[PDB]
Design a protein around this ligand. Sequence first.
Ligand SMILES: [Cl-]
Ligand SMILES: [Cl-]
Ligand SMILES: [Mg+2]
Ligand SMILES: [Mg+2]
Ligand SMILES: [Mg+2]
Ligand SMILES: [Mg+2]
Ligand SMILES: [Mg+2]
Ligand SMILES: [Mg+2]
Lengths: 235, 235, 9, 9
Amino acid sequence: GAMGSMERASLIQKAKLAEQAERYEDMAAFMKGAVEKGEELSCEERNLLSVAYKNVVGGQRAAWRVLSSIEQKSNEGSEEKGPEVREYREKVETELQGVCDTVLGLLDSHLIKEAGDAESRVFYLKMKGDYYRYLAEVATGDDKKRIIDSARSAYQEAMDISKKEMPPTNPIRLGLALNFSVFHYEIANSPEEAISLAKTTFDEAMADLHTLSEDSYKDSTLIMQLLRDNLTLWT
Amino acid sequence: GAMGSMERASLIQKAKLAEQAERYEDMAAFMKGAVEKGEELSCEERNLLSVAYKNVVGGQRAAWRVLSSIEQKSNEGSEEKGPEVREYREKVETELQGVCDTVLGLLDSHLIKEAGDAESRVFYLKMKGDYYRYLAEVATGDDKKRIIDSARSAYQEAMDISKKEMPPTNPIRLGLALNFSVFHYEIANSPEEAISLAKTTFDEAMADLHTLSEDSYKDSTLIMQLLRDNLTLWT
Amino acid sequence: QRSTSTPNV
Amino acid sequence: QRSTSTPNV
Ligand SMILES: [Cl-]
Ligand SMILES: [Cl-]
Ligand SMILES: [Mg+2]
Ligand SMILES: [Mg+2]
Ligand SMILES: [Mg+2]
Ligand SMILES: [Mg+2]
Ligand SMILES: [Mg+2]
Ligand SMILES: [Mg+2]
């Protein structure tokens, strides 16, 4: 609790500054501190939390993929180079897992349980699915299955709520469906499920665009284009 | 000395991996560990050290400039927002200063004193000038003058050696002259000195290109173009 | 080529 | 616009 002495509002202010400065590790630390104040988060604050951690873990994931590729090449008439590639991949991996565990911990203590509105609850459950998905990307042990199931379960709970409580064009509903489709294709070895989910999501959103303002239209169509990009890649 | 238990060669190996993964903080930590083994550094190793720290401090400098601009705007009919902008600028600033101090410390204990070849000594003195320059960018206190003088002194010693011992096209000699010209323009309020140094450096290099191989030509002309870019900006 | 997930903004 | 210093490569 290094942020325990800082006002909630000052933490949020500094998170916004950190975002402007592209200091995402600081941003994440400020937002962790804000969460640990124990109050629920507004929509803007939820997005600050998400942006911060997604940028941190995104950098870690990219680094992990670089190192994993080098390691795989080392294991092909490749000359023995000793333990260093594996050691350093493991270092990065452990740090990535630590960040995922930190986010999951915030969600479990106590963001999800206090989230009663569909917008908040879906947002947090989507986050939960995403960070388990990131853990699944690097998992190989006796627990890859359990990690995959944890991701699936979170995504599924989010989906069920989103379908009941949000319009098909809601950006969080769309983003959830996008990420769950990625889970199906990339993690769960279920490309047909991925394709179906992306197609159904896109089509139901298309049919609801007429209800939207110009600005909401822009928000929804941005994510719809991502669904389309994946469908184009996958088919 | 967190790296004290790791082999020198493993540190260098992992620095190269970190570079590939764009993990510059790790790269810098590995290279600090390598330096602290107490052996002199090869040319490739010197460049790993430089790349690592330059990338770390470069990110800090960019963040500092963002925050400083926000702070300056706050101090213009600007609404009072409290201490947070200043606090966070100061946080980043302190971290930047710490990285500069770490590099300077490596140079002082004991890279420079052990560097007898012109190539190594000039390289380290250029580094010394550069990190004092970075300290000068954020200095405002009773010591901005002394910091500026420390940068100047390091650059000048490097210049004197480079002129005696290296050809006018040597990339380190060119890079030193480039950075010292930036010091003159941006730090020392001496644009005419900057312009003169850049022009003389460019012209003397131009006149020596004929002595070079295709590959050395490419190395020298890359830095010469930077001198030209500054001359175009400055005149 | 990797699938696209949600943007971070 | 800022002056150009040495590249980092
Ligand atoms: Cl390691
Ligand atoms: Cl702060
Ligand atoms: Mg309070
Ligand atoms: Mg592991
Ligand atoms: Mg099929
Ligand atoms: Mg040894
Ligand atoms: Mg200060
Ligand atoms: Mg004049």
